[PDB]
Design a protein around this ligand. Structure first.
Ligand SMILES: Cc1cc2nc3c(=O)[nH]c(=O)nc-3n(C[C@H](O)[C@H](O)[C@H](O)COP(=O)(O)O)c2cc1C
Ligand SMILES: Cc1cc2nc3c(=O)[nH]c(=O)nc-3n(C[C@H](O)[C@H](O)[C@H](O)COP(=O)(O)O)c2cc1C
Ligand SMILES: COCCOC(=O)/C(=N\O)C(C)=O
Ligand SMILES: COCCOC(=O)/C(=N\O)C(C)=O
Ligand SMILES: COCCOC(=O)/C(=N\O)C(C)=O
Ligand SMILES: COCCOC(=O)/C(=N\O)C(C)=O
Ligand SMILES: COCCOC(=O)/C(=N\O)C(C)=O
Ligand SMILES: COCCOC(=O)/C(=N\O)C(C)=O
Lengths: 360, 360
């Protein structure tokens, strides 16, 4: 089975092609993770996935999505991740982390607590920042503060500091969150970037914040550990052909800047879209990015059955299959997939105290 | 769905009828549990089961089955369970513990490390004790030492001390391990008990160790928390009708002695048996014990599908359905069962950071 072939990138070898993508838990307090995360991540890692990318972790307090988001903006925040890193490793999985800045989507309620921008009378809210003073709209009406050149320098340094902290905590895989309408995505998109300086307008200018952040992180992230990013390559906004061509060109420049793998996603930059949700719908798009930018890729959003994941790998559409929600349903999903795909000794996808008994 | 109706026993209310029965992990060192158990138990409790009975925990070092078995023979051992108790309660499940003494089946290798008695030349092993100096046979050939009267007094006090510690550590449910051919079961069975003193021979004498241990534990275990036991009520040894009749009579004496619920199992006292393994095969036996001894019961050994579990409850064969191996496969099995049985808001069997997304 292709899903259960190992994968080597730089000095890191994953035991299979199942990746757990970053999934916010909204359970942190003042950015500090706790026993929710410790058990959540350790259990999924024991489930058998080869790579576990920890949830969007804010590089600065105002870069959290919600008051429940994890942060890594101080050394104390980074030290809190050390037992998560070590528990993922102890399970035989590879610990990764997505470092993030929510941009204009920040200062929002948890999804089961309204999912909307926090009210200005609520003591939990904060001022958001973005390329331009333009609101997402819909359930996120708060207008962000337009960043100055000094803000751009500071946020870039925050990504650098976060990458250095993640390195020292023992993460072996880093993902820059340039997707999903948060800060990085919003610099790239003409929907949200109306700037008239070096960081808006042309393709080079809109790419500049993302390329400069990648280059600054590259200075401190080890050359022998995978340096990756998540990027929304189209919006389903009626501009898909031109947007995908530009996004693929940016992927070429990411590769020239030392990126090892691209997590291919959807932009979610504005609400006025028509995303064609369906099983493995990102397959053909990820395949095109992979082939045209000549870069390894993963994707998500509907690959969460064993046969769909296997098919995407056999078709060379993906190098790793990211399986998110199925691992919330079943933290041992990788074992379930090994059983369904007829892997020999499938129960030994799990550690011995489970594997021995599920073999019979 | 009967499976998702709450259950109240003494002052304890379980949110559904799904119980996770004790399942040895063989991962402790010198009796002390560790990060294996912490994540293992916390993840299963978050999965939605109403009651989680922690694995067979030895009341004395020689009462471990293996060198990997958990123990509670000192206050330091008991304090190590506190974070497990806390994590089970934090998930909304009820923490229980099975306290145990392996008797003549002690000093054995882990199941994936030979599953047999440790050799006499192997320094990891220890002398075993039992009612009589007679081996189980087969893969457990070691002849135990016949217990002295002082041994009997000491082991009873060890059960008391273990129950006292479990109480003070915050367990809300206790299970005396009188099943599966270990010490207590071997006092009851004529196969293993050849004693000629007050603890062997007659039905009263063979019952004596179990009744005296129950009474001694009853003195330190709170009135308002369920006091339960696991007991093998037949062997499938060709003596089933007579053995079941005597076992039900003992269950009546357990009830008179304050037992609140009986976990009905098979004796496993000797290897020369013909156990008719199959789906829900214990259903009719558990029902007969429940009805004739007028005690609430649980059972296991093949109820691990949602429909089999639901059927056993609707037929009033069980009060709680114990689902073991399916929870090793999927720690969120209770959520899987809620979906299959069409429970409304089935995803909210899980905590919010999962439930919100699995509801869609
Ligand atoms: C609860 C939850 C949290 C998520 N958090 C993140 C995140 O922090 N960063 C990110 O890039 N994507 C995040 N996502 C998107 C997922 O990584 C993934 O793309 C999505 O769940 C689709 O894959 P799936 O169909 O296998 O679930 C999250 C998704 C969910 C359901
Ligand atoms: C790994 C494992 C450990 C077990 N440990 C115990 C134990 O410590 N005490 C006990 O009474 N039964 C123990 N059992 C038996 C189970 O509690 C249960 O009766 C058995 O797994 C059958 O239920 P199931 O079909 O739902 O798995 C264990 C079973 C397994 C597979
Ligand atoms: C305390 O155990 C942490 C996780 O340990 C495992 O998952 C494991 N075996 O149990 C291996 C070899 O990976
Ligand atoms: C509608 O938004 C979908 C894309 O955004 C995400 O997946 C995400 N973080 O990247 C979270 C926390 O939801
Ligand atoms: C399926 O694993 C093979 C044997 O499993 C069992 O029957 C069992 N518990 O379920 C024990 C403790 O022996
Ligand atoms: C509200 O979620 C219900 C599940 O319980 C928890 O939250 C939890 N552990 O279970 C911790 C340590 O946060
Ligand atoms: C073949 O024996 C089955 C009955 O014994 C058990 O289930 C048990 N403990 O009670 C363990 C640890 O296996
Ligand atoms: C989860 O079921 C509802 C659909 O929501 C999503 O697709 C999603 N992630 O999978 C996010 C972050 O919005």
């Amino acid at each position: 089975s292709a899903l259960f072939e190992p994968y080597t990138l730089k000095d890191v070898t994953l035991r299979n092609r199942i990746a757990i993508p970053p999934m916010c838990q909204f359970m942190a307090e003042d950015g500090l993770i706790n026993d929710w995360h410790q058990v959540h991540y350790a259990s999924m890692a024991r489930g058998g996935a080869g790579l576990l990318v920890v949830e969007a972790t804010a590089v600065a307090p105002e870069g959290r999505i919600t008051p429940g988001c994890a942060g890594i903006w101080s050394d104390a925040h980074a030290q809190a991740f050390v037992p998560v890193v070590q528990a993922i490793k102890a399970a035989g999985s590879v610990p990764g982390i997505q470092i993030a800045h929510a941009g204009r989507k920040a200062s929002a309620n948890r999804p089961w607590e309204g999912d909307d921008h926090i009210g200005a009378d609520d003591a939990r809210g904060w001022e958001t920042i973005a390329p331009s003073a333009i609101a997402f709209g819909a359930h996120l009406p708060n207008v962000p503060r337009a960043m100055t050149l000094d803000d751009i320098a500071r946020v870039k340094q925050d990504f650098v500091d976060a990458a250095r902290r993640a390195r020292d905590a023992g993460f072996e895989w880093i993902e820059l969150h340039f997707a999903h309408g948060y800060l990085g995505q919003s610099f790239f998109s003409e929907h949200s970037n109306k700037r008239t300086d070096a960081y808006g307008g042309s393709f080079d200018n809109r790419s500049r914040f993302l390329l400069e952040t990648l280059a600054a992180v590259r200075e401190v992230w080890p050359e022998n550990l995978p340096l990756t990013a998540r990027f929304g390559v189209l919006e389903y906004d009626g501009r898909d052909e031109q947007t995908l061509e530009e996004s693929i060109e940016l992927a070429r420049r990411f590769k020239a800047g030392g990126l090892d793998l691209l997590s291919v996603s959807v932009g979610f930059t504005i609400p006025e879209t028509n995303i064609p949700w369906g099983p493995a719908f990102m397959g053909p798009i990820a395949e095109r990015v992979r082939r045209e930018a000549k870069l390894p890729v993963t994707s998500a959003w509907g690959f969460g059955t064993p046969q769909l994941a296997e098919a995407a790998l056999q078709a060379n559409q993906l190098d790793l299959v990211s399986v998110g929600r199925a691992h919330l349903a079943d933290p041992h999903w990788a074992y379930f997939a090994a059983k369904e795909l007829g892997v020999e000794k499938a129960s030994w996808t799990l550690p011995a105290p489970y594997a021995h008994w599920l073999e019979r």
